[PDB]
Amino acid sequence: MVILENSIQNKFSAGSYPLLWSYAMGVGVELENSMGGLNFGRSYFDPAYFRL
Amino acid sequence: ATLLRSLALFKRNKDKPPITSGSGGAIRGIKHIIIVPIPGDSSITTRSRLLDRLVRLIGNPDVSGPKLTGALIGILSLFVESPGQLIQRITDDPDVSIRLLEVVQSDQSQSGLTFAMEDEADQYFSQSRFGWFENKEISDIEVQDPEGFNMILGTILAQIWVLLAKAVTAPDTAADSELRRWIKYTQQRRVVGEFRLERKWLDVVRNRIAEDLSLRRFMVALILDIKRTPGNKPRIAEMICDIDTYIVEAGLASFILTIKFGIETMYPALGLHEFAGELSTLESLMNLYQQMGETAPYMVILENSIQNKFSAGSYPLLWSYAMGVGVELENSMGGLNFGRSYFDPAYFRLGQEMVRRSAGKVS
Amino acid sequence: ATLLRSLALFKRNKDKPPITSGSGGAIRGIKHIIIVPIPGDSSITTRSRLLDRLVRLIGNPDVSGPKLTGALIGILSLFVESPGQLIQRITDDPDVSIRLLEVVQSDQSQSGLTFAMEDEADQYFSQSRFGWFENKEISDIEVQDPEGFNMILGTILAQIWVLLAKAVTAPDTAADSELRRWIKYTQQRRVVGEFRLERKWLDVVRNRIAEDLSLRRFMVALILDIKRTPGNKPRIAEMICDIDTYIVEAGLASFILTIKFGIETMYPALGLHEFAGELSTLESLMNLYQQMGETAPYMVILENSIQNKFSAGSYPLLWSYAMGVGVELENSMGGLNFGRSYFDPAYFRLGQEMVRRSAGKVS
RNA sequence: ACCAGA
RNA sequence: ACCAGA
RNA sequence: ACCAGA
RNA sequence: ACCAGA
RNA sequence: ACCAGA
């Protein structure tokens, strides 16, 4: 949907769930080495749940 | 227990949309001829010349109400084959009669365009107060390739459709928000980054979309026609339905955020009896929202009479609780202005208190 | 006996860490772009050249606040594969935004390094006031083998991490103590003994670690990341966690030595009633110390607000008793400066008296 | 805030 | 209301 | 929008 | 009516 | 009969 770049990939964006996404980046970068290279820079990050 | 279902039916009739088709036809207003210059002929070249002579028409302090709305309806539908059967397909506005005129290119006219009336077109299309691009080294944006015009028109439309998102809700403080969408369509390679129309061109259009109502009814009702297109949409039309995620529910966030923070979190401060009557007049507004159909996220863009019913004044206590839950959870809710004459901050402080008490307090 | 548990709960709430996550996001300060020159590419050769051009960058009176902190964060993370995903892994400082730039080697540039901006790097990296090694026969420390650079970088880091131990507590009188750790890592064959950076290079860094706070938050929070590494740590990282035993609790020794000498010896002069209230506000500081987690031995290195609570001014009598027990037992406690405006030497002399009375006096 | 700590 | 509190 | 994936 | 939303 | 209600 984002290769075809349709309008419905705005709906799967992490901005609609900005807290539970940051929690999953906190679980994510602590578990795998591979998640350390993922850039997650957004204007809704809220790092208090990333640290949680 | 006969009072309970007699109470719930009482709120499913006074909070019900009125049945229609009772007017025989004596409500229709006095009409108003508007002038929408549609692209002339099959060829790509004249519709790029039409876009060029009609963007700088808008950046002009001498254009009127109808001439500007017809200029915008003229460029918001250049992205289709035969725009004439799109305007009369979309416009069901009762206060505006489309009299749309074909524009063909010429080498006799001054502007380069005649009407299919050779010099009469020059009074239709024609320095520090003319709105134009920010890189004002640009003189003309007339091109001859189809994919060139497809990217220039997609650039001009993508910064007129983002105006609609908060032309009527936050008109003045929309300059910082709409730039963040211009940055979005630049790194997606949707638009070209060079052809950014300036602050003064967009403030003509944003003031126009705010001040008349038949332009918004055209902008809403073609978005609703973009959504119904089943297959792969054309790429400017996909972009309009992509901008649409910022235009939907824009002005209902005293109701959407009341659902998102007051209802869906389910703190123990919803079993208060003072909310128990206001969870039912918010339950009936969720029944009413989905039976209004696909025109329901645009009720304050279209500015109909039913957006007074979704106002937070009908649930002034449970709304304030949800602003208290809201501004304590997100950084983004700190910028929301909620200044109303029914605020009651004792439940706003009760809304913040349920979040702070339930910090590490898994249910 | 209802006053007793009402008293103990009174001291387990005013001496309690405040609950958090109440700020929506409107506390975050104005940011500050810092420049951390990360090593460029997989190859060992450019990160030895980066270390060479960035050690002598620090020994320079013309470097600023941010340029020096970004130089130190640039060299304190050269010991890992891909230092770029370490800086953005560690830094949760709200006052500093890392803008880290890759540095690749070149033969075109003057210094030998460009940015992945060929000559713009030469104004980034560039005699009696340039800080450098004590054996200043050295010109360059660029090497080409991996185990050579692993021992040179381990030598440079082992005398920057020992600066952190008392950069903020005893900054001036740290010159004799930090040499005793340099002697420790020389006979362990951890470092090379030749490459001792001089007094004037380290006094740039020790003054820097003292005067800004976001450098210490990077130095602390990577130490806390070294500890979490489960298996055999890499050998420079093992050395940093080896230096760490001198950095922990550094500035809490009016509290650690109060526990060690006042509490744990258990002389009969703890059943004084004047201490009975101050053994409970020291019991609650031991409950508070272990529920702050792994950031608790660094509370005065990080200089947070909770190290005012572990101060000896809240227990000014039982602390002085423990300085009296302390300086009478060890030779090493004779060098400790305890000069405070709450000393009360009548309990310091009572602290020494319990040691002298209990000389051969097995309990 | 200040000691000693292979 | 009043002290001391890296 | 960004990681890793015989 | 006002926030954030690849 | 009296309020508030983009």
XYZ file of N, CA and C in Angstrom, chain C residues 52 76-77 86 181 183 210 217 222 272 275 286 350-351:
42
model
N 42.966 10.282 15.985
C 44.141 11.141 15.995
C 43.760 12.601 15.786
N 34.335 8.831 22.809
C 33.882 7.869 23.808
C 33.026 6.758 23.230
N 32.740 6.783 21.934
C 31.975 5.726 21.302
C 32.667 5.160 20.072
N 24.853 3.834 18.416
C 25.074 3.882 19.852
C 24.696 5.232 20.434
N 44.935 5.250 39.411
C 44.219 4.348 38.525
C 44.971 4.145 37.228
N 48.175 3.943 37.140
C 49.135 2.922 37.529
C 48.461 1.558 37.588
N 32.792 18.687 34.202
C 32.214 19.398 35.330
C 31.220 20.463 34.882
N 25.474 13.017 31.243
C 24.355 12.129 30.968
C 24.662 11.160 29.844
N 25.894 5.481 29.031
C 26.477 4.361 28.309
C 27.106 3.361 29.257
N 20.958 5.968 71.577
C 20.627 7.324 71.974
C 19.321 7.732 71.319
N 19.472 9.874 68.109
C 19.696 9.177 66.853
C 18.486 8.396 66.398
N 17.697 4.315 52.569
C 18.140 3.056 51.998
C 17.027 2.344 51.255
N 32.087 12.230 70.289
C 31.413 11.047 70.796
C 31.578 9.886 69.837
N 31.803 10.169 68.556
C 32.024 9.091 67.614
C 33.398 8.485 67.770
